[PDB]
Assembly symmetry: C3
């Protein structure tokens, strides 16, 4: 059901803040879906995050700095004792300034035992940075393991460079046939992966040839460090000058 | 009111928190958020503060963000359940996480004078940083605190560049009269999470004037999260042999 | 320090979330995992100078997760500061998309440490591009206890805004007169950038008259600030320009 989605807590993709922790071995360190610990030693605590205050004001918040599309939240009870959360509300924030509630704060169905996971796919996927589970009803104690499942994210880095220029009365302004003027370009910083480059006109100064305009600009020899900006014309056209801006973007 | 419109980093779980030392497993940074309160009827859940284990002028709590922020303010508060608080501190920060810097060249910032009354420090100039640290310099009783950092809201963009969308040589714009269009569907390499805006501009032009007039255009139509229709066009009596464009599509948040 | 100079120390800079398989107890957790972490040697209650697992088997791990992709150059391993416990070999696993995971060297063991405090660096055969990375201890002395660091290339963060269809209007002022002539259209970005952007501003629609067979048209930003810029459309000489349209791309760094 969750194929192709990111398991946020399993991949350590969020910070976890809780309202309260029962003690130092019942914390959010123990909150991942299917977390299991040493069943022969009591000292490592609970197979769950468990609160210290038992009321309807507790919560665990997962925060991402990069916005995510949340598809599903999975809840699970406590692995080593009969404590589990039977319903909960979801709150979330995209800008980390205003918070909203899923279903206007209505309860979502939780679990009924220690280990059987209950997935909730949100009615509409939720676009958010931070998301919180607020237990509303429970068996025994407020104790849970959980996961959030998000669409995979993509990360880009873009560099813009302005005003790459042929010069006045450039080599395109004499001769005939295919002709080019090459201007090397160095990016401000080196990209981590090979960028794609858009390179488009902002200033055109050219002569038609039997009423035809023929002008072009294209990158060549694109690397992580820069590229060659190739201005060109062809046929009998005489082009005094061309200027272009570029946009270079690398992914992941 | 003073921090209205700003992001409360710790409250929003926007940073990782590393400490120099923790008194024990119930005095950790899990207890550090401003106004954190716990079970006052049970001792086992520990302090209403992060408390260090070593008491000297070398302790700290570091908040780390991967996405750069403009830090407006840091708020300090004492320990909720005992008379322990930090009376002055210094601030260090890093933008690139290689070089670190000291706010006010390491000079002291005024802290708090009681358990619960928050003292906000707005930085003399806002600090652009990824990571930021509070280094207690003086204290009452023990090095124990709750805190918050307040940043401007961040925006996140994702950009895709696509090169060389082309009409073809001697395209349909090279015949006829009036408004004429050649449509080239474009599919982005990946689907955006939200609707992008698209810039789509010329990189090669091969066209004939009409009574000395040049008339050429290119424009996206039907932009979705998956792609768009690249519409090349001319109008009036102009004949256009070919046009080429590159696009830049960016989605926010 | 010299061998990793100029690289980002992830844990030291609090750049990652840390998830462990198990923690011995609440004072043996990943809070104690940073390279060279040292604690109160006079008081036992603050625990170990290491993350120490609760289960001692080949299924333990510590995961470092970053939301922004990094180029991982090196992993440093260190033993426990306060007891004779350390990890003698381990495997490295990682993921870029946080869906599919991969094993470094097809899961072969990487050499760990031989004592409490002497750090052993492993520079990856090829730098690893990833979001999340995990240390899986394979062999150990005494217990599974470690301090560690990951070193990455510095990251750059950009924010980009695209705005479409900035227009002179039909039959604009460039369509009369002689000499250098400009039509200025102020542009406000949808949001204010945190730092000064660079701006690409390029044509998407051209409606102009040649002059003695010459085309002379231009567009350029002026007075770029964090909030916006003036879009300056222009011609010169005897050219008459009915209209010009442009799209912009503005990007701010760090
Ligand atoms: C390669 C090239 O020049 N193609 C252009 C085409 O040019 C042709 C010449 O190749 C041909 O020899 O003579 C023609 C007139 O007799 C014309 O110059 O011109 C096309 C527009 O009609 C188009 O501009 C091609 O770029
Ligand atoms: C709709 C159109 O083609 N507008 C262009 C305008 O074209 C005009 C025609 O509308 C009119 O019928 O006849 C005129 C010549 O008498 C001319 O063709 O021309 C403008 C430039 O002068 C501009 O190019 C408009 O785009
Ligand atoms: C300043 C200018 O308009 N430069 C363009 C140049 O214009 C020259 C004039 O400088 C000169 O005074 O007169 C010439 C005609 O007799 C011509 O207009 O023309 C260049 C192309 O040949 C280019 O367009 C310059 O931008
Ligand atoms: Ca420009
Ligand atoms: Ca191109
Ligand atoms: Ca456009």
């Amino acid at each position: 059901s969750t194929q192709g989605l990111v398991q946020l807590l399993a991949n350590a993709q969020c910070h976890l803040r809780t309202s309260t922790n029962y003690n130092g071995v019942h914390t959010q360190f123990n909150s991942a879906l299917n977390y299991k610990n040493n069943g022969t030693n009591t000292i490592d605590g609970s197979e769950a995050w468990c609160s210290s205050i038992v009321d309807t004001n507790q919560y665990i918040v997962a925060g991402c700095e990069v916005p995510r599309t949340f598809m599903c939240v999975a809840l699970q009870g406590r692995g080593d004792a009969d404590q589990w959360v039977t319903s909960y509300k979801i709150r979330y924030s995209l800008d980390n300034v205003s918070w909203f509630e899923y279903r206007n704060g209505a309860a979502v169905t939780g679990v009924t035992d220690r280990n059987t996971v209950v997935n909730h796919f949100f009615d509409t996927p939720i676009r958010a940075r931070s998301i919180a589970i607020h237990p509303l009803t429970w068996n025994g104690h407020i104790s849970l393991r959980c996961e959030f499942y998000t669409q995979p994210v993509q990360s880009s880095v873009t560099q813009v460079g302005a005003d790459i220029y042929t010069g006045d009365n450039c080599a395109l302004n004499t001769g005939s046939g295919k002709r080019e003027v090459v201007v090397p370009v160095k990016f401000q910083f080196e990209f981590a992966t090979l960028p794609k480059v858009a390179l488009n006109f902002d200033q055109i100064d050219c002569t038609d040839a039997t009423n035809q305009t023929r002008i072009g600009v294209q990158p060549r020899n694109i690397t992580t460090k820069g590229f060659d900006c190739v201005f060109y014309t062809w046929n009998e056209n005489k082009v005094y000058s061309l200027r272009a801006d570029y946009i270079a973007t690398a992914l992941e």
